[PDB]
């Protein structure tokens, strides 16, 4: 089971940790999360919104040139884009069961690959980045994700200036961070939190 660094097993539920790893579900979950974080800020211009281009440049017949109806046409140089895109939302509907199943799937591979480090308790005394660096040097971890039951103010003020370390919460973690960071640091208060959230 999840051997804590204090030399004590915990006997987690085997449905969340230690399950089949369906990678298509995880791919869908991370794609949906990464697309949902994008803000849609795009605005080109059709042939109707470009300034000018009201009247025909010349007659239909007798001129010798091609049939032109307006200056601001997509074929013309200064005309508008034929398929100009207004701003739109990029948000995929992911089911509540499907999102939780992706968490249960990735947390199993985190245990299998030994990326998950569980600790009895992780807490800092005062806000100071070097103190947290020394605290992490005890475990010998670099580029680690810190997941805790509650993000303390002292812990949050630290690690913002730190380069590769990020602090999250069980109700604030995402499928992307759990795979991105090299190591994930959970607490015994947090592994119980996943029980009621996932299964």
């Amino acid at each position: 089971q999840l051997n804590v660094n204090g030399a004590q097993a915990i006997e987690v539920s085997e449905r969340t940790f230690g399950g089949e790893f369906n990678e298509t579900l995880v791919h869908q979950a991370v794609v949906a999360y990464m697309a949902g974080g994008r803000q849609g800020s795009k605005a080109q211009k059709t042939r109707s919104e470009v300034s000018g281009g009201g009247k025909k440049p010349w007659r239909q017949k007798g001129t010798g040139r091609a049939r032109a109806g307006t200056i601001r046409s997509p074929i013309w140089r200064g005309g508008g884009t034929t398929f100009a895109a207004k701003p739109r939302s990029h948000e995929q509907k992911l089911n509540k069961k499907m999102y939780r199943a992706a968490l249960r799937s990735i947390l199993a591979e985190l245990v299998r690959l030994d990326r998950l480090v569980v600790v009895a308790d992780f807490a800092v005394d005062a806000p100071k980045t070097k103190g947290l660096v020394a605290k992490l040097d005890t475990l010998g971890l670099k580029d680690v994700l810190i997941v805790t039951d509650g993000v303390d103010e002292n812990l949050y003020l630290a690690a913002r200036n730190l380069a590769h370390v990020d602090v999250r919460d069980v109700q604030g973690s995402d499928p992307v961070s759990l795979i991105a960071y090299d190591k994930v640091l959970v607490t015994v208060s947090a592994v119980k939190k996943f029980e009621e959230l996932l299964g």
Binding site: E23, T24, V26, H27
Partner: protein, 47 residues
């Protein structure tokens, strides 16, 4: 790793583009055929 995982085979397709090349299969027409109502912009037969 985000650099490793993918979808299952057949779950994702590529949205074939009409009007590109000639080896693509949909070249120069886009599967519309030839002259007629159903070959032009807004060429929608009413239901």
């Amino acid at each position: 790793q985000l650099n490793d995982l993918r979808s299952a085979p057949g779950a994702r397709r590529e949205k074939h583009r009409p009007g590109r090349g000639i080896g693509s299969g949909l070249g120069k027409t886009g599967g519309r055929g030839h002259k007629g109502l159903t070959s032009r912009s807004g060429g929608k037969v009413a239901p």
